[PDB]
Design an enzyme around this catalytic site. Structure first.
Site, PDB file in Angstrom:
ATOM      1  N   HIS A 237      41.903  37.008  44.078  1.00  0.00           N
ATOM      2  CA  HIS A 237      41.623  35.571  44.112  1.00  0.00           C
ATOM      3  C   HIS A 237      42.372  34.903  45.269  1.00  0.00           C
ATOM      4  CE1 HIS A 237      40.235  36.672  40.122  1.00  0.00           C
ATOM      5  NE2 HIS A 237      39.666  35.488  39.988  1.00  0.00           N
TER       6      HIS A 237
ATOM      7  N   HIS B 110      37.156  26.119  44.131  1.00  0.00           N
ATOM      8  CA  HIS B 110      37.074  26.536  42.733  1.00  0.00           C
ATOM      9  C   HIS B 110      38.242  27.418  42.306  1.00  0.00           C
ATOM     10  CE1 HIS B 110      35.666  30.495  44.119  1.00  0.00           C
ATOM     11  NE2 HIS B 110      35.881  30.902  42.882  1.00  0.00           N
ATOM     12  N   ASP B 111      38.804  28.209  43.215  1.00  0.00           N
ATOM     13  CA  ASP B 111      39.880  29.133  42.875  1.00  0.00           C
ATOM     14  C   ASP B 111      41.135  28.860  43.696  1.00  0.00           C
ATOM     15  OD1 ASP B 111      39.341  30.789  40.684  1.00  0.00           O
ATOM     16  OD2 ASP B 111      37.986  32.050  41.863  1.00  0.00           O
TER      17      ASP B 111
ATOM     18  N   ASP C 116      30.135  32.684  41.891  1.00  0.00           N
ATOM     19  CA  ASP C 116      31.414  33.307  41.572  1.00  0.00           C
ATOM     20  C   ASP C 116      31.272  34.813  41.393  1.00  0.00           C
ATOM     21  OD1 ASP C 116      34.053  33.744  40.905  1.00  0.00           O
ATOM     22  OD2 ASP C 116      34.154  32.077  39.487  1.00  0.00           O
TER      23      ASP C 116
END
Ligand code: PCG
Ligand code: PCG
Ligand code: PCG
Ligand code: PCG
Ligand code: MG
Ligand code: MG
Ligand code: ZN
Lengths: 816, 34, 816, 35
Positions: free
Chosen positions: A553, A593-594, A714
């Site tokens: 990530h 988003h991450d 994703d």
């Protein structure tokens, strides 16, 4: 006339006739105002008629406007005449600081006296302790005491006798009883004719004490009820003012005491607040230890800190309201000059002062403090206790309004108020703590913002204004930045930016950052919304720095998801349902988003009780990524939405929030049957134009579709070619193994087989199950929705086939 | 007046003052991470 | 027999009775010579009534019993007035409307208390306007009705219920200070057609004694009720202010504590939700159509009605308080629907005779096995300061058995009102927890961006290459071998000299040179510092420093290196232990950690969160706080293998040294160091001076404080080829702050901080040298003769700066 | 038995919608160098 014989023959009939037709009239006459008909100028034995007249006279005084002093005075005169006495007196029972006292109210009452000559003013009362005196013996014994001779009595004293120039020979007393607590004592001083008071005289006293007790009982009950009502109102209003808001101790104590000024019933009161500085800094204590200045020698608190009234608030109520706040009051101040507040801070004891000028311990002012002649007479000073028993203030209540000295009822009323005020220091304590915590949080947020923000030197790696024009990026014109950016940025066609098989393996992190600005340019959202190009470049670099350097990530995962969203919105023609602003917010949401992923999933956050889990309840990391992204965008230099409208900015922020929160799988799994109906509606519709028009209006359908786009981007690693999927799956497995090792080390819990490092050879089987469980439904429905998404469905099928082959090979190997 | 005292309340025994003590006695999904 | 003749001749009857009757009497009559009190029977009736009234007065004196005393008065009054019966109607106030209920009914001259007392379940409650009893109370004035048939306010409900007929009614309220206590009423005149004027005059005057009893009884009830209200407000405040807790714990503690004064068999408190809006993924099923919208009851604030938790208090029988999370609608408290209705409307509901109620489905019979039937209910809403209902409190079955009157209504209302305002404490508690969690998240984000990662430490401590293992697994002996080979020797860079220059070394070598400094002091071995931790801490400090012009990582090693030089080359270590030197050098490293580039004054003027948090020595305390926080982390704690006393001593020493770097504090305490150095000349030799100084703590702390200042300004003592460049860095940083002040603060900067007056820099340097650096190094050279090179170099640098200032001054004069 | 000839309930001769009380809302040279 013969009937007169009938009446005499049976007097019982006559009595009944009278009880029928004249008893009411006679009782009306007796209960009328009237007056006593007994001759009070002699000493004859009281006849039953005279006894009835006296009793009726006493009952006449029983009215609604029951003046206790007057009614008791009348029965005192009747007792004088009945008991053949010279004088009698009545002493009230007052309770000072623990030690009870007896103070006269009716004095020198004789048979030819009036209220004006017997009523005792509060400054004329004769206070008497419980220990000394016949009256003190009466109160302590709580029973009738008869003294046939004062000389032989062991408790008799001559203080009043010398003070009043009178000689007392026989003392007869009885305490008025209201339950168990004594209220008043009525006593006799002499017998006019007789050696002493006989038992018959005593029997008369208890017989006639019924009226005095009833009159005294009403007065005592009324006073107690009024005091309790005042206490309740004080507590309620003080609680209201305390809970109005959260402030410091100075403002809070000001409100509560000012509000209860009507219920307090004091001409003046002042409160001095003690400094809370327990320990002084090293530089302040150096001169004391070095001999530059002498050490403190003045009054000291029981806790060991110096007594320092740094702020005194005084309330003046006898004339015009003159509430004043005195910062750093001098010792010459009228409240502190006497030294009583200083003494209370030294010890911490409730003090009631009667006739303060006559006191010798404290130098109370003996002269009128006010131009109108106001003079200190009664003082009551008490501490504020505090929860930790550290006295935070001293409340001093001056002259009472009615003029009577402070008693136990007023002590209790003020004691409750002071106790409540001392309890209500948690709010000022929390007020400072919350302010300090908020300041520290702001400081550390500024720290993280600087550490994630791209500085002025790093931005020159992309926006090379110094090497082209020699100026700083913030000085160059908008056109100049575009020309530099146009030359610097990569070409979308060359790098296959808008394709479904884009691979970031042969590109550097800076190149990926340069790619994102190119995506924003290609989406034509830069010119439409006049996004500052310098901020856009700085925003992407700040995102790259904010993304952690953990295994999977990381920033490369953040770009690939955003790359997947851009490829969707362009190639798959899914932008037809979305506005340009919606496209702008969606790509930014995919990129952010991450952001700042710790490397552990939601379950680890709950299990380890991470501060994220305590703050965010449902979606721990997904809300945190949204919060950090919004914080990044809030910065002036990093804000790319600064040129948007107020409505436009709100719409983008809401849509980003929807996307980032929906990024998680738990929400996706529940709200995925809705997507099944949405594509079904598309198939039901005849041509794409009407369906596109329907989506262009309906919002809940678009939002659900956007969530599906997020959960498809994703998991877009699974649909990439086999050469890319083979490596990314290994990174995902490595991150899960790291989380499992962290779990085993920290929480002493066995990791799940998916996260287990030991079961590294079961990865193809888990990937096959994951593909059949999650990605298949999304990519199958998206391909049905739009035919352009078919290469995604081709990719996942091939990857699933390869993973199934690997799993079959592993199973065959384990078969043996 | 009746008590012959005009100035203020008088007490027979006058010593060091006494003060009250402060009142304190009364108070498949689970397998895949989710 | 002959009564009719006597009535027809009132004159004859008066004349005959006025005669003096003989000494002989009928029966006793307490004949103390009373036959002739202006009438034959007047004394006889006077004696009887005086004796009868005296017995009543005795009854009132002890063990006050209003029911019995009033009964005797009414029984006697029945014969006086000839009314067929009398009755007493008590006054009560429920829901804000007044009602009147029977307590003593149909008393007759031959009745008893058991046949006249009305139990609370047999009360005929009469509202204020549905009867003559209502009209009397409403008018607060006596009413004499001759014939009741024509009375407009009369209702035959009571007399038809008891199977009776009324013809004439007498009634008057029993006032007590404008408040009505009861209304005594006599009906059905047995002798005359109605009640005459003389009959009514008796009724007022004879009822004064009954008025006294009801006045006493009412006052006792009011006094007791106000006493209970004072206790619950005092106890609730004590429990509320105990600590900061959520709504459930705070409400549970307060209600449980005051269970004694409530006098209720049972009561339950249900807590409402506070979720104003639902989240998007919960709105989708409603809008799309998967779920139906909520159409049930709602709060006045527009909130869904849902008691998420109900606390049950059972006081009758056994105390088994229960807490039911998510209670069902079948719960005994919520089944009635009253707690629901109160929340919808925000009313205060008082219910008398609950089984007879219709609107609320109260249970038909027993609730539990104990056969407890709900009879009287009182429910109120708990409302906070924002006029929102947070819960509903419902009380059942008053312990005394009487319905909940006004006194009980105001008692529970005060409790709920106080607890409603206390919700602010819970809201503050939630906000504080959110702030603390948010701060901890930011602190973690700070730590990662500052702490040296796993891959960065390999630059200084390569173990994956030399040994192939991560540093966390290598033993200490191996790590030292790696460091000894990698770390520069003491001769590679002149860290032992006063002329050390950091402008020919990279930042990595500066960190390595820092590790070498710790090795030369010998603190690594004796304190057993983990070598891996030491490298990680040094790198973290390097990353902790910002990337600003002057106050960068280079400033923080030069100060540290100068401190190392002073201790080892200046021979000031003789006064300090190795541990003190260990902490003193580290304070050089964290001397300007996380410096934002602006001085202390700018922080206050800009109102940074730093300024609000600290106040005095804003940045110096900030560096100490950040440095200690960085040292608190386990992987960066060099002070980990130390005793608790030693660790506290190191931290305490670090506190003084860091804050001593402030120039404002130095200017106020430099005279103390002047005294200390003067004491050196008093002693004979350095050996004696060392022995004396090495023991004194305050004197050592004073010298170390100005040792920080000497190292802080050590750049001036560097050779001219170094001081010239460093001064430009100092000037550039001050110009950056000056430009900032002109931009946002809109204030004209001082000539020292002004970029326009750059040519004045040599003059400012000379003035600053003659002001600050002159004293520090002159005294140190006098103190220790080895510091002389620091003083000679400063004078040469002052000479160089003086020439530049003179040249600039000459140019200005030539231009002018 | 009671003289009022009623058992088991405080019978009220008023037949109508009950009224409930409203809540009470009655507020019850140094400076040259930046030092
Ligand atoms: N002159 C006068 N003295 C009183 C009167 N009542 C009480 N005393 C005196 O006040 C004194 C109080 O202490 P004692 O009871 O021993 O004796 C009492 C009496 O001697 C009064 O009415 N007039
Ligand atoms: N078992 C498995 N899970 C994955 C894979 N790829 C993504 N995920 C999971 O799907 C999730 C999508 O949201 P995240 O990126 O935050 O974290 C991801 C991972 O937890 C994969 O290849 N195999
Ligand atoms: N049987 C009986 N009825 C009474 C008595 N006192 C009052 N009432 C009746 O109760 C009724 C209450 O309302 P009213 O005052 O209009 O009229 C009253 C009388 O009719 C009593 O002592 N005995
Ligand atoms: N005018 C001037 N001020 C300095 C110089 N060196 C340090 N200072 C100032 O003295 C202060 C003390 O150390 P700091 O680094 O915290 O900040 C410094 C600067 O504000 C210098 O060379 N010239
Ligand atoms: Mg995620
Ligand atoms: Mg500093
Ligand atoms: Zn992701």
């Amino acid at each position: 006339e013969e009937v007169e014989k009938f009446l005499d023959s049976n007097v019982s009939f006559a009595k009944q006739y009278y009880n029928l037709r004249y008893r009411a009239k006679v009782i009306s006459d007796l209960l009328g105002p009237r007056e006593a008909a007994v001759d009070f100028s002699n000493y004859h034995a009281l006849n039953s008629v005279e006894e009835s007249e006296i009793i009726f006279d006493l009952l006449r005084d029983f009215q609604d406007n029951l003046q206790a002093e007057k009614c008791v005075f009348n029965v005192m005169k009747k007792l004088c005449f009945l008991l053949q006495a010279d004088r009698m007196s009545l002493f009230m029972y007052r309770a000072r600081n623990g030690i009870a006292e007896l103070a006269t109210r009716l004095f020198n009452v004789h048979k030819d006296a009036v209220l004006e000559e017997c009523l005792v003013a509060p400054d004329s009362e004769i206070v008497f302790p419980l220990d000394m005196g016949v009256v003190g013996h009466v109160a302590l014994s709580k029973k009738i005491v008869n003294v046939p001779n004062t000389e032989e009595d062991e408790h008799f004293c001559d203080f009043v006798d010398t003070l009043t120039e009178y000689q007392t020979k026989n003392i007869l007393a009885s305490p008025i009883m209201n339950g168990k607590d004594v209220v008043a004592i009525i006593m006799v001083v002499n017998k006019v004719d007789g050696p002493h008071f006989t038992e018959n005289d005593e029997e008369i006293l208890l017989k006639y004490l019924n009226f005095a007790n009833l009159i005294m009982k009403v007065f005592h009950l009324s006073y107690l009820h009024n005091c309790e009502t005042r206490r309740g109102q004080i507590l309620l209003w003080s609680g209201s003012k305390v809970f109005e808001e959260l402030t410091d101790i100075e403002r809070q104590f000001h409100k509560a005491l000012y509000t209860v000024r009507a219920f307090l019933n004091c001409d003046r009161y002042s409160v001095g607040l003690l400094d809370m500085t327990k320990q002084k800094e090293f530089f302040d204590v150096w001169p004391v230890l070095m001999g530059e200045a002498p050490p403190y020698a003045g009054p000291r608190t029981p806790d060991g800190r110096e007594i320092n009234f740094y702020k005194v608030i005084d309330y003046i109520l006898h004339g015009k309201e003159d509430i004043k706040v005195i910062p750093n009051p001098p010792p010459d101040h009228w409240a502190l000059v006497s030294g009583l507040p200083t003494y209370v801070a030294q010890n911490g004891l409730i003090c009631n002062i009667m006739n303060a000028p006559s006191e010798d311990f404290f130098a109370f002012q003996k002269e009128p403090l006010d131009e109108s002649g106001w003079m200190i007479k009664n003082v009551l000073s008490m501490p504020i206790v505090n929860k930790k028993e550290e006295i935070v203030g001293v409340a001093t209540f001056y002259n009472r309004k009615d003029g009577k000295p402070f008693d136990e009822m007023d002590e209790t009323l003020m004691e409750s108020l002071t106790q409540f005020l001392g309890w209500s220091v948690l709010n000022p304590d929390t007020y400072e703590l919350m302010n300090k915590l908020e300041n520290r949080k702001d400081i550390f947020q500024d720290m993280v913002k600087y550490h994630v923000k791209c500085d002025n030197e790093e931005i020159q790696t992309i926006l090379k204004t110094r090497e082209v024009y020699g100026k700083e990026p913030w000085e160059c014109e908008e056109e100049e930045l575009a020309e530099i950016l146009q030359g610097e940025l990569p070409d979308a066609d060359k790098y296959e930016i808008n394709k479904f098989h884009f691979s970031d393996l042969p590109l550097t992190e800076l190149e990926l950052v340069k790619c994102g600005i190119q995506m924003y340019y290609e989406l034509k959202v830069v010119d439409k919304f006049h996004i500052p190009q310098e901020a856009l470049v700085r925003f992407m670099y700040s995102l790259s720095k904010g993304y952690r350097r953990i295994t999977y990530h990381n920033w490369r995962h953040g770009f690939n998801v955003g790359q997947t969203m851009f490829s969707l919105l362009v190639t798959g023609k899914l932008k037809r349902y979305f506005t340009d602003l919606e496209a702008l917010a969606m790509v930014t949401a995919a990129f952010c988003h991450d952001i700042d992923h710790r490397g552990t999933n939601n379950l680890y956050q709950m299990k380890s009780q991470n501060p994220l889990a305590k703050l965010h309840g449902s979606s721990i990391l997904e809300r945190h990524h949204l919060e950090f992204g919004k914080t990044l965008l809030r910065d002036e230099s990093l804000n790319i939405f600064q040129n948007l409208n107020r409505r436009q900015h709100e719409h983008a922020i809401h849509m980003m929030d929807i996307a980032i929160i929906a990024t998680d799988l738990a929400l996706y799994f529940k709200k995925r049957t809705m997507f099944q109906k949405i594509v079904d509606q598309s198939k039901t519709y005849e041509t794409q134009q009407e369906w596109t028009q329907y989506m262009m209006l309906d919002q809940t359908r678009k939002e659900i579709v956007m969530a599906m786009m997020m959960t498809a981007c994703d998991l877009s690693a699974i649909t990439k070619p086999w050469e890319v999927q083979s490596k990314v799956a290994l990174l995902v497995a490595a991150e899960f193994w790291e989380q499992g090792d962290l779990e085993r080390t920290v929480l002493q819990q066995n990791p799940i087989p998916m996260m287990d490092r030991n079961k590294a050879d079961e990865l193809p089987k888990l990937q096959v199950g994951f593909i059949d469980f999650v990605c298949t439904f999304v990519y199958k429905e998206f391909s049905r929705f739009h035919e352009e998404i078919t290469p995604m469905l081709d990719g996942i099928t091939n990857n699933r086939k390869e993973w199934k082959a690997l799993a079959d090979e592993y199973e065959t190997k384990m078969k043996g | 007046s009746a008590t012959r005292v005009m100035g203020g309340p008088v007490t027979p025994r006058k010593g060091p003052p006494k003060f009250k003590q402060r009142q304190t006695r009364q108070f498949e999904l689970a397998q895949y991470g989710i | 027999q002959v009564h009719r003749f006597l009535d027809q001749n009132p004159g004859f009857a008066d004349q005959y009775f006025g005669r003096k009757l003989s000494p002989e009497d009928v029966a006793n009559a307490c004949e103390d010579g009373c036959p002739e009190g202006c009438t034959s029977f007047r004394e006889l009736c006077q004696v009887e009534e005086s004796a009868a009234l005296f017995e009543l007065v005795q009854d009132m004196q002890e063990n006050v019993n209003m029911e019995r005393v009033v009964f005797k008065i009414l029984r006697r009054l029945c014969s006086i007035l000839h009314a067929d019966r009398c009755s007493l109607f008590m006054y009560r106030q429920r829901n804000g409307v007044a009602e009147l209920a029977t307590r003593l009914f149909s008393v007759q001259p031959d009745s008893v208390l058991e046949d006249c007392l009305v139990p609370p379940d047999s009360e005929i409650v009469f509202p204020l306007d549905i009867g003559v009893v209502g009209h009397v109370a409403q008018t607060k004035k006596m009413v004499n009705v001759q014939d009741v048939m024509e009375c407009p306010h009369f209702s035959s409900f009571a007399d038809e219920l008891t199977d009776y007929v009324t013809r004439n009614i007498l009634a008057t309220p029993i006032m007590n200070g404008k408040d009505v206590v009861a209304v005594i009423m006599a009906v059905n005149k047995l002798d005359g057609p109605c009640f005459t004027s003389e009959d009514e005059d008796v009724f007022l005057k004879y009822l004064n004694f009954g008025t006294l009893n009801l006045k006493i009884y009412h006052l006792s009830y009011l006094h007791n009720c106000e006493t209970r209200r004072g206790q619950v407000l005092l106890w609730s405040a004590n429990k509320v202010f105990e600590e900061l807790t959520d709504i459930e714990r705070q409400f549970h503690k307060a209600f449980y504590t005051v269970r004694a004064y409530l006098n209720c068999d049972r009561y339950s408190v249900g807590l409402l939700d506070m979720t104003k809006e639902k989240e998007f993924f919960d709105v989708w099923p409603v809008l799309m159509g998967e779920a139906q919208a909520y159409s049930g009851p709602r709060t006045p604030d527009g909130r869904e009605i849902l008691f998420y938790k109900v606390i049950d208090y059972i006081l009758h029988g056994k105390e088994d308080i229960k807490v039911i999370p998510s209670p069902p609608a079948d719960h005994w408290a919520l089944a009635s629907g009253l707690p629901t209705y109160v929340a919808e409307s925000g009313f205060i509901c008082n219910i008398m005779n609950a089984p007879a109620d219709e609107m609320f489905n109260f249970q038909e019979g027993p609730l539990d096995d104990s056969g407890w039937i709900v009879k009287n209910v009182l429910s109120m809403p708990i409302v906070n300061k924002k006029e929102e209902i947070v819960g509903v409190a419902t009380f059942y079955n008053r312990k005394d058995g009487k319905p909940f009157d006004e006194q009980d209504e105001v008692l529970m209302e005060s409790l709920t009102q106080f607890l409603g305002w206390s919700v602010l404490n819970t809201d503050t508690y939630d906000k504080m927890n959110k702030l603390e969690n948010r701060k901890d998240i930011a602190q973690d984000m700070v730590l990662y961006h500052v702490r040296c990662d796993r891959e960065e430490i390999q630059l200084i401590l390569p173990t994956r290459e030399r040994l192939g293992k991560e540093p966390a697994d290598c033993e200490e002996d191996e790590l030292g071998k790696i460091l000894k080979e990698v770390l520069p020797g003491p001769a590679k860079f002149d860290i032992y000299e006063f002329h050390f220059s950091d402008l020919e070394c990279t930042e990595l070598e500066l960190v390595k040179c820092g590790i070498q400094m710790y090795y030369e002091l010998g603190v690594v071995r004796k304190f057993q510092i983990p070598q891996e931790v030491l490298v990680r801490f040094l790198f973290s400090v390097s990353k902790g420093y910002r990337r600003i012009t002057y106050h960068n990582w280079r400033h923080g090693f030069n100060v540290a290196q100068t401190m190392f030089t002073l201790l080892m080359t200046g021979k000031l270590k003789s006064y300090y232990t190795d541990l003190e030197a260990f902490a003193m050098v580290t304070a050089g490293l964290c001397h300007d950690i996380d410096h934002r580039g602006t001085n202390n004054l700018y922080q206050m003027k800009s109102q940074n969160p730093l300024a609000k948090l600290h106040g005095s020595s804003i940045l110096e305390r900030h560096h100490l706080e950040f440095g200690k926080f960085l040292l608190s982390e386990e992987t960066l704690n060099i002070y980990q293998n130390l005793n608790r006393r030693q660790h506290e001593h190191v931290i305490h020493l670090m506190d003084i040294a860091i804050i001593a770097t402030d120039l404002a504090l130095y200017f106020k305490k430099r005279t103390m160091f002047q005294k200390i150095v003067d004491e050196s000349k008093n002693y004979e030799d350095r050996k004696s001076w060392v022995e004396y100084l090495s023991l004194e703590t305050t004197r050592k702390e004073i010298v170390m404080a100005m040792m920080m200042t000497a190292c802080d300004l050590s750049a001036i003592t560097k050779p001219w080829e170094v001081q010239s460049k460093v001064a430009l860095l100092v000037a550039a940083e001050f110009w950056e702050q000056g430009d900032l002040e002109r931009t946002v603060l809109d204030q004209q900067p001082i000539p020292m901080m002004d970029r326009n007056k750059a040519a004045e820099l040599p003059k400012l340097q000379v003035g600053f040298i003659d002001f600050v650096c002159t004293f520090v190094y002159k005294e140190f050279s006098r103190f220790h003769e080895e510091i002389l090179p620091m003083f000679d170099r400063l004078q040469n640098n002052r000479k160089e700066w003086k020439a530049l200032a003179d040249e600039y001054e000459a140019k200005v004069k030539a231009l002018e």
